[PDB]
Each structure stands twice: as C-alpha cells, then as structure tokens.
C-alpha cells in the first residue's frame with residue numbers, strides 16, 4: 001500500500017558517524033562579525049526570502065556580496081549557516097566570509113566572497129566543447145564534496161552556478177534549500193526550480209537523497225550541449241513530468257513508479273499519455289553539433305534516469321571518459 005523506502009547508495013551514513021554538533025544546526029551558536037565592516041553598493045537581486053547586494057569590506061576594500069535574510073524561521077537561517085560553515089574550503093563551494101547582524105534590529109546577513117560572474121543567458125551561448133567539460137567537472141567536484149559531507153544542495157540550476165569565465169572560476173551558491181541527509185528521512189519535495197526537479201519530486205516521493213542533485217546537473221548538461229535552456233520546459237509541475245516523459249519515454253517512467261510502489265495522481269494518467277523513448281541524437285543539429293560527442297551523450301544518458309538509484313554518483317561521473325581531456329590537463 002505504501003511507497004517502498006530507499007536510501008542513498010553512497011555516503012549513506014556520513015552524518016550518522018559524525019558528532020551531533022556537525023548536523024544538529026538547531027544547537028549551533030553563531031559567532032557574529034561586525035556589520036559596520038561592510039558598505040552596501042547596489043542591489044543585485046531579491047528572492048522571496050532574501051535580498052542580495054554587492055558590497056565593499058571597508059577594512060581591506062575588497063568586494064563581497066551581502067545577503068540580508070528576511071524575517072523567516074530562525075531554524076532555516078541556522079541550517080544554511082551550519083551547512084556553509086561545514087562546507088567552507090571545499091572545492092568550488094562559495095566561501096561564507098562573515099555573518100553579521102544589525103545590532104539593534106534582529107536582522108542577520110550572510111557575507112560571501114565576490115564572484116565577477118558572466119550571466120548564464122549570455123555565457124552559455126559562447127562556451128566551447130572544452131569549456132563545458134571543464135565547468136561540468138568543476139561542478140562535480142563541488143557536488144561530490146558536499147554529498148561526501150552529508151549534504152544535498154537541492155537547488156542546482158545555472159543561476160546558482162556562478163562563473164567568472166575570464167578567471168575560469170566557478171562557485172556553487174545559494175545553499176538556502178540545502179539539507180543534511182539522514183537515511184530514511186522523508187524530505188519536502190517542494191525544492192529545486194521547476195525545470196530542474198527530479199522525477200522523485202514530481203511524483204511526490206519523499207525518501208530521496210543526493211541523487212536528486214545529479215538529475216539537476218543532467219538537466220544543465222543537456223541545456224548546454226544542445227543549446228536549449230532550459231531543456232525540459234514545463235508550464236507547471238505536472239507538465240514538467242510530461243516534458244520528461246516525452247524524451248525518456250513513459251514505459252521507463254511506469255517501471256519506476258511500479259518498483260517504488262508509488263501512487264500517481266489520477267490526473268497524471270491522461271496527460272502522461274504514451275511516449276516512446278527518444279534517442280539523444282534527435283536533439284543534435286548543425287548549430288549545436290560541435291558541443292556533442294558520443295562521450296557527452298553516453299554521460300548525459302547515465303545522469304537522466306528516472307530511477308534515482310540508477311543515476312551516476314558525482315565520483316562515477318568524474319571518472320567518465322567525457323572528462324579525459326579535462327583530467328589529463330589538470331594533473
């Protein structure tokens with residue numbers, strides 16, 4: 001009657017064998033920096049939860065980025081802080097440089113290293129085959145690191161991957177949806193941007209894990225080598241799963257549903273319809289072919305799998321021959 005349970009096939013117990021203080025962010029005591037070290041220069045963007053500014057550290061005149069956190073649950077604020085501290089120093093993880101507070105009002109803000117990024121809507125149009133391989137490898141380093149440290153990012157998308165292209169510099173940002181993995185825990189499926197949501201999320205399977213990030217990465221990869229961003233473009237969450245089924249096919253989707261004994265909304269049957277699995281080669285045209293290779297398609301095919309347990313891990317992905325030239329020239 002109920003859905004079959006699942007656990008991560010790698011890094012399953014990394015929080016289990018770490019001390020309580022590592023993952024119990026509720027108990028963490030924050031060490032506050034000095035708010036008056038930073039001057040805001042211009043608003044960079046705003047979410048539902050935060051507003052983000054370019055700023056200057058006036059003690060050394062370095063650029064930073066300041067994210068002022070709206071009146072939300074302190075628990076959510078502490079989770080992001082603990083995660084950023086836990087991951088600090090990891091490869092291509094955005095550095096949390098400081099945590100400050102208006103000393104009179106309650107209002108906390110996170111201070112990050114500045115990345116002089118090129119906007120992905122502009123950058124992706126200009127990347128070469130080698131650039132994509134290089135940057136995908138760099139994202140994989142970050143994901144393997146944070147997974148190995150017991151953390152799911154849960155919001156992997158181009159806007160959260162900052163690239164200073166002239167310095168070949170990449171940082172994975174926005175850890176505000178990130179969460180500690182504990183085996184058997186049922187997580188909120190309302191995470192990730194619509195276009196990067198895994199099948200587990202769209203069918204309301206809550207016992208997911210690190211492999212969610214690997215789907216999102218697969219979605220990014222597709223959008224880059226095929227020059228179609230985003231690759232799966234649904235108008236809502238139901239339609240998002242339909243866009244996926246039109247490429248991956250409905251037969252493998254129903255096998256997935258069957259294996260985990262997942263109960264699908266009645267709605268879904270009529271709209272999912274019946275679709276053959278398409279060959280990846282179908283999305284190759286004159287304009288994107290210089291970015292596509294047999295290795296790329298084989299790699300992509302091993303990321304975009306319905307069954308979260310069958311997707312490559314970050315370490316397996318880094319071993320794929322798609323990256324041979326990158327690994328070779330990084331040793």
Ligand SMILES: O=C1C=C2C[C@]3(O)COc4c(ccc(O)c4O)C3=C2C=C1O
Pocket residue numbers: 044045052053065066067094112113114115116117162172173174175176
């Ligand atoms: O949790 C977050 C959230 C953001 C949002 C945002 O502030 C947007 O834009 C940024 C940036 C960081 C550096 C940077 O150079 C930049 O332009 C961002 C973050 C880093 C994080 O860890």
